[PDB]
Amino acid sequence: MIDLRSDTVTKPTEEMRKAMAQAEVGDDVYGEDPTINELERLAAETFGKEAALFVPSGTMGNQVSIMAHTQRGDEVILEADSHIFWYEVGAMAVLSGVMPHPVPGKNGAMDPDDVRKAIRPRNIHFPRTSLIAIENTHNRSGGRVVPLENIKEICTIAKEHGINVHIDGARIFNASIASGVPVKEYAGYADSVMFCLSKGLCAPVGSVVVGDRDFIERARKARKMLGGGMRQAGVLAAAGIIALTKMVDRLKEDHENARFLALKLKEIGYSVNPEDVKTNMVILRTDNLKVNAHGFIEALRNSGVLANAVSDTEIRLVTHKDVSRNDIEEALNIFEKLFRKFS
Amino acid sequence: MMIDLRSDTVTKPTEEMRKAMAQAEVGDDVYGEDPTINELERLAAETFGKEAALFVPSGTMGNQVSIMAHTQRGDEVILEADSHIFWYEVGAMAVLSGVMPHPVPGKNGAMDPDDVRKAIRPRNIHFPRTSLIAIENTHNRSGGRVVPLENIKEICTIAKEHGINVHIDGARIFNASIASGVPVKEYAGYADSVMFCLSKGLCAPVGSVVVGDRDFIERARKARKMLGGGMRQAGVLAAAGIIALTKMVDRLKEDHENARFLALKLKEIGYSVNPEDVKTNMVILRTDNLKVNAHGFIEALRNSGVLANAVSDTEIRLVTHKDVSRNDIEEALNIFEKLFRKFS
Amino acid sequence: MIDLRSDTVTKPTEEMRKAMAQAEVGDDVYGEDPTINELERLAAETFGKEAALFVPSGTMGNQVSIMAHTQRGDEVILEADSHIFWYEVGAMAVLSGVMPHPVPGKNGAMDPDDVRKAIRPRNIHFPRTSLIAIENTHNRSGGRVVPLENIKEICTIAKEHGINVHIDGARIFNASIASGVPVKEYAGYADSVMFCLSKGLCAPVGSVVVGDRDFIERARKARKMLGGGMRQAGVLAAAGIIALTKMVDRLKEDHENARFLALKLKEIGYSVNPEDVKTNMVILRTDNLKVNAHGFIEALRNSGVLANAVSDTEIRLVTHKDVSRNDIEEALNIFEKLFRKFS
Amino acid sequence: MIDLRSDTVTKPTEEMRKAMAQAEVGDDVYGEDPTINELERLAAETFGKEAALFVPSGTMGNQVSIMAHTQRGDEVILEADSHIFWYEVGAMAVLSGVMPHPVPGKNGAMDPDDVRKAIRPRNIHFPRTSLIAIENTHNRSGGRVVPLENIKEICTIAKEHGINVHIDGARIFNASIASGVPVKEYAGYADSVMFCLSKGLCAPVGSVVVGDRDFIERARKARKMLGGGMRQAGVLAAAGIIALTKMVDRLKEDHENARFLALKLKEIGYSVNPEDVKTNMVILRTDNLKVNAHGFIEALRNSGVLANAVSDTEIRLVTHKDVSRNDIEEALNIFEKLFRKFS
Numbered sequence A, C, D: 001m002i003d004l005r006s007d008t009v010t011k012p013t014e015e016m017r018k019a020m021a022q023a024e025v026g027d028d029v030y031g032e033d034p035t036i037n038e039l040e041r042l043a044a045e046t047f048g049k050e051a052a053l054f055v056p057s058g059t060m061g062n063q064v065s066i067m068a069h070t071q072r073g074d075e076v077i078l079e080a081d082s083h084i085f086w087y088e089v090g091a092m093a094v095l096s097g098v099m100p101h102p103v104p105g106k107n108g109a110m111d112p113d114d115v116r117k118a119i120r121p122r123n124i125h126f127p128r129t130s131l132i133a134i135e136n137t138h139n140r141s142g143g144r145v146v147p148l149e150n151i152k153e154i155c156t157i158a159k160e161h162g163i164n165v166h167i168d169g170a171r172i173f174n175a176s177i178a179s180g181v182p183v184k185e186y187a188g189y190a191d192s193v194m195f196c197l198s199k200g201l202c203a204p205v206g207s208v209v210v211g212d213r214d215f216i217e218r219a220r221k222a223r224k225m226l227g228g229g230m231r232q233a234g235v236l237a238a239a240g241i242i243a244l245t246k247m248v249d250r251l252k253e254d255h256e257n258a259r260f261l262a263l264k265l266k267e268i269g270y271s272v273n274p275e276d277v278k279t280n281m282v283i284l285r286t287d288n289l290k291v292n293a294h295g296f297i298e299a300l301r302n303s304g305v306l307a308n309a310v311s312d313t314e315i316r317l318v319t320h321k322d323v324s325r326n327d328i329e330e331a332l333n334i335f336e337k338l339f340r341k342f343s
Numbered sequence B: 001m002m003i004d005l006r007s008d009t010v011t012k013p014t015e016e017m018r019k020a021m022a023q024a025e026v027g028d029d030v031y032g033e034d035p036t037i038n039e040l041e042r043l044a045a046e047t048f049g050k051e052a053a054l055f056v057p058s059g060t061m062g063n064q065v066s067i068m069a070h071t072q073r074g075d076e077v078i079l080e081a082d083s084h085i086f087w088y089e090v091g092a093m094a095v096l097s098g099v100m101p102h103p104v105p106g107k108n109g110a111m112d113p114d115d116v117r118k119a120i121r122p123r124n125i126h127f128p129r130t131s132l133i134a135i136e137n138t139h140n141r142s143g144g145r146v147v148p149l150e151n152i153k154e155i156c157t158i159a160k161e162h163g164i165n166v167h168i169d170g171a172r173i174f175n176a177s178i179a180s181g182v183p184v185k186e187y188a189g190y191a192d193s194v195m196f197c198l199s200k201g202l203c204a205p206v207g208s209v210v211v212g213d214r215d216f217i218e219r220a221r222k223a224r225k226m227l228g229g230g231m232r233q234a235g236v237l238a239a240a241g242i243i244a245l246t247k248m249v250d251r252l253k254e255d256h257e258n259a260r261f262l263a264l265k266l267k268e269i270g271y272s273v274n275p276e277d278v279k280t281n282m283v284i285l286r287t288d289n290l291k292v293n294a295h296g297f298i299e300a301l302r303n304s305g306v307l308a309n310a311v312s313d314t315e316i317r318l319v320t321h322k323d324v325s326r327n328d329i330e331e332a333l334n335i336f337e338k339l340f341r342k343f344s
């Protein structure tokens, strides 16, 4: 099976397996796991922040950040098609008791003026806007890169209003490789950032939240409350350190494979836009096919290719370390066969 | 005094209401022993063709206990993108029920049935369960617009197929009914619960009512207790409510006629208004062609003796009600005319 | 019917009925109801606080106070048999996301030393103790008065720890009448005080919360969220002013009637302890009767007396304005006849 | 350093490090991790339940169970000194919006009659009692074994009222080893059971919840919301399988060591009760010493012995795989010296 469903399916490299087996560990609840401690120190340093927190998943990373930045009844401004709003089981309402305030965005970039208008005036009928979330390499729009200038202007707006800014940077390294903007620069215009180690970076488990000392202390207590307070998590952190320090550069290979995939799919005749492919995702439309997205995903599966439908007429293809050029070439042969059948 | 066009919530008690309240037969509602509250609820249920009803201190509580009784923690509630529950209820749905709003754009409060269908979440571990669809009749933000019965009917059909609850925020459902000629029981027939206000156009000093099935109302009553709405001798308030429900509905037509007159005349003056959009007691005025924004115009109006609310930086809302007579409207219009000269 | 079920059943006096009819009103959401404003002004003044907030019920008064004093995950120290812990539908957990930390007490008085031990130390595993609640004229213990010294000592402990103090003073005036301690004296040892107007004071609806301006502003927003933001509530406030300003002194009559009732019931042969009757409540045990509390309550109803069973062997009798000495004497004749039948 | 703070400090065995390194993995979100799937299958099998769910910690294990057994506003009956109430950061109130209803217990055993009386009657003022929690091998009381008879009785009561029963079995195997009661028998009197792999069983991370298929489905969704939905978690499950299948028998060694430790401490003169030591814990009182628990803990630390204070006058000592009889002897020599200084 050629897995193009997501970059979450990446498996540990041999270097990672050895590192986990030889991991120096301790009880993290007491802050005594050396490897977890080093991963957090490294993560904080890399993002230009004073502190960091390791978590079991990007969802918990986002949720502890929301809890640490807000109070019950607050409102959180976020992009209309963001992961926090659509794919996190409504956790923000249950855990933090906060309201989402959706703002339309163009490929992840909310117009600064719209953000300004989304901030609630001081009134008894309205919740207090205390957080603005930005997702970089906006998933739903096809792994699009949010311009640094966009984040910079929103940060200015936030500062004037005393509002916190959190970047959902699950794939922030993909954004950095594509844009040439160091992650510490994106983070310089945010109060906190969550990034995943378990997707394109290939770690088996976990993400990290970076930010100020006080913020992280609150997020650490939130993590304890949610059930993320683990013991000898250094076994996971060992692979995390390798993901952070050795798996970033090669992300360019995933981007190269995504573009190649898009160009060939277009050449075949599929409804794809190579010009929109800047990171590791390709959106394919079923508009010119005698079947919808769901029916096409089924056809692909029966032929050996796995992918997810994101709407009734759109499917998402995602490249990563475990889908080589060879697999991309094989996938294309299948796509070519299916095009003749469904065009 | 001032010409108050800010909202219909400012209506004061009629002479008949004051006497009824002061002479109300009461009891302890916690024991379900207040005779006036009981009669108000019986009358409300009957009027909407439902089995039961619950008196609450505000429309906000009416909506929130309904949301609580219809949902479980983590569920999603589909509602109109500019609805009151979403924008003006202090984020209560999140704090009180732990639910997520699922905004669906609507044309004048009417969410496209197919859009509602698409908004229902598929069963997936990543997604919360869609357990409630809320509809606001005479959608406030759009200008007191009337949601067509057929729209509500279509959404009900969709909800039923999916086992989803339907709640109508009918704060001004009687205005909708007067304008459309559709009995409120018909709108309610396509919903599981309906909340309606007695304290706005109907002129009661305090209160709203939620109507629905017996079991739902029992659950809503427990939610009311938890929220702090379980009052004692509330019969004092229910006395005015009975009069509002039974004698103040027909005259809403007068408020509509006044709002239409106001809109037509504002249009003649040259203001950015759409008389064709005015079917109930509200008029939206845009300040696009004025040399001042909404807030600046509101201040100028206040300075001239007219009260109104800005609903955006370019829009103002004018609301008619029992306490603004046709003569008051004429006076406001004469002022609106002079201000047009000053700001045009 | 002679209603001894509770003081909540009190009906409006003729004075109140007239006041409600001619009450000057306005939209309270805009802070424009003159009568509500005067009631809050008078209440704040009466308890020596900066501000006050009118609410639909004592339950909401307690809940908006908890919300205004706490943050999600905090702990609230309260008496093990208090109304907030027992009869408020678990609202503190749902509305504020806080956890109760029950402390046993002797007739409503928690041992100051136990309160100190209940304060959580700073640790990632523990919620932060941010509030201590005290109930005066403790309901479940039979309308007992909490000593001023107890409240004074707990206030000292709270201050030393930066913890807020809330007095559930639903029947604080009854406490004051019995102890001779002015309500301002009680209030001085608390950050906030909730007191009911709808019980012994005879108003038909409402309670009031008093405290500092910032606290009341937060409580007012909580009231809006909960659904307590009414419009022309001046009609209710008119009766409320009369309840607060003219119905306090006569509470002494309820206390006298309760004691008289108790002394005579004991004389008849009922299991009552007149010595325990400190305010307007009398606890009657049914152990020596041929039927239990529920069966006896039914026999009483048949004879024209209403009361509530609080357990299988206990009945609570409560006196109030609508229970005159003549009603007490008539009730006693009924109790006399029933003792002949059920002893 | 001789670590007697907790059994959570246990480090991975050689067999475990190798297993993690070669673990076959997959994306758990897709239910595709074969090692996680095998661990859950084995757990369900071992406890005689239909399904199982791996979680990052015992705290999440308890919290997803509570969320899956209850609705907002419900009440949960639990032992007055249970972990869920004291050491889980008020999570039940924030996550589930439920109220704890503490019930006194003798070393973790709540009197069945007290439990019956704690169940709320159907009344608008009361929350609905939807769950009863029992902690077998009650931590606070000193790792005490709750009698099977007690659990059976409470199960009978729960059935009568249609109430769910959850056993916090963080140390259910220690209880089984000491009582001779198979874990499957304990589980038979409960709807759900949470047990840890990260304590005495020596896994670096994780716990498991077992129960009916529908309950586990709800718990799994709760896990996703809380942020416990990991990817290639098989790395951790590999050590978990070894913990569950190979590390149970040797727990007897920890019990022998704890008993020996207690016996010798008593001979030295310390306030311990060797007769109360049946599993891997020893409670040491400081009432007969010159310093309190906190001061004695600091003295022990300076001498090479780590332990935690559980109150101002009580210290908890816990044995585990990483504490050999030799380590206990060395510790005893240290305690001996300190008795001379602080007795």
Ligand SMILES: Cc1ncc(COP(=O)(O)O)c(CN[C@H](C(=O)O)[C@H](C)O)c1O
Pocket (backbone or CB within 6 Å): A005, A006, A007, A008, A056, A057, A058, A059, A060, A062, A083, A084, A087, A135, A139, A168, A170, A171, A196, A198, A207, B126, D229
């Ligand atoms: C921007 C962003 N933020 C947060 C998260 C949540 O992280 P996890 O909880 O999956 O580790 C994801 C993962 N997303 C998953 C994927 O893409 O396969 C799916 C969509 O849930 C994400 O893409």
Ligand SMILES: Cc1ncc(COP(=O)(O)O)c(CN[C@H](C(=O)O)[C@H](C)O)c1O
Pocket (backbone or CB within 6 Å): A125, B006, B007, B008, B009, B057, B058, B059, B060, B061, B063, B084, B085, B088, B136, B140, B169, B171, B172, B197, B199, B208, C229
């Ligand atoms: C559709 C609808 N639903 C619910 C409510 C809430 O009712 P209350 O809580 O104010 O009684 C309102 C009141 N609305 C008020 C007004 O129009 O003046 C303001 C906007 O909050 C409403 O218009």
Ligand SMILES: Cc1ncc(COP(=O)(O)O)c(CN[C@H](C(=O)O)[C@H](C)O)c1O
Pocket (backbone or CB within 6 Å): A229, C125, D005, D006, D007, D008, D056, D057, D058, D059, D060, D062, D083, D084, D087, D135, D137, D139, D168, D170, D171, D196, D198, D207
């Ligand atoms: C009965 C019981 N239930 C649940 C938990 C929570 O498990 P984790 O979240 O620590 O994995 C613990 C851990 N307990 C810890 C320890 O003993 O060192 C401390 C006390 O929090 C426990 O003892």
Ligand SMILES: [Ca+2]
Pocket (backbone or CB within 6 Å): A007, A008, A009, A010, A011, A198, A199, A202, A203, A204, A205, D231, D232
């Ligand atoms: Ca991975």
Ligand SMILES: [Ca+2]
Pocket (backbone or CB within 6 Å): A325, A326, A329
């Ligand atoms: Ca090749």
Ligand SMILES: [Ca+2]
Pocket (backbone or CB within 6 Å): B008, B009, B010, B011, B012, B199, B200, B203, B204, B205, B206, C231, C232
């Ligand atoms: Ca009104």
Ligand SMILES: [Ca+2]
Pocket (backbone or CB within 6 Å): B327, B330, B331
């Ligand atoms: Ca005129």
Ligand SMILES: [Ca+2]
Pocket (backbone or CB within 6 Å): B232, B233, C007, C008, C009, C010, C011, C198, C199, C202, C203, C204, C205
């Ligand atoms: Ca009363």
Ligand SMILES: [Ca+2]
Pocket (backbone or CB within 6 Å): A231, A232, D007, D008, D009, D010, D011, D198, D199, D202, D203, D204, D205
């Ligand atoms: Ca361990």
Ligand SMILES: [Cl-]
Pocket (backbone or CB within 6 Å): A023, A024, A025, A026, D011
């Ligand atoms: Cl190690």
Ligand SMILES: [Cl-]
Pocket (backbone or CB within 6 Å): B024, B025, B026, B027, C011
């Ligand atoms: Cl009456």
Ligand SMILES: [Cl-]
Pocket (backbone or CB within 6 Å): B071, B072, B073, D070, D071, D072
């Ligand atoms: Cl729920």
Ligand SMILES: [Cl-]
Pocket (backbone or CB within 6 Å): B012, C023, C024, C025, C026
């Ligand atoms: Cl008036």
Ligand SMILES: [Cl-]
Pocket (backbone or CB within 6 Å): A070, A071, A072, C070, C071, C072
């Ligand atoms: Cl908060």
Ligand SMILES: [Cl-]
Pocket (backbone or CB within 6 Å): A011, D023, D024, D025, D026
């Ligand atoms: Cl593998």
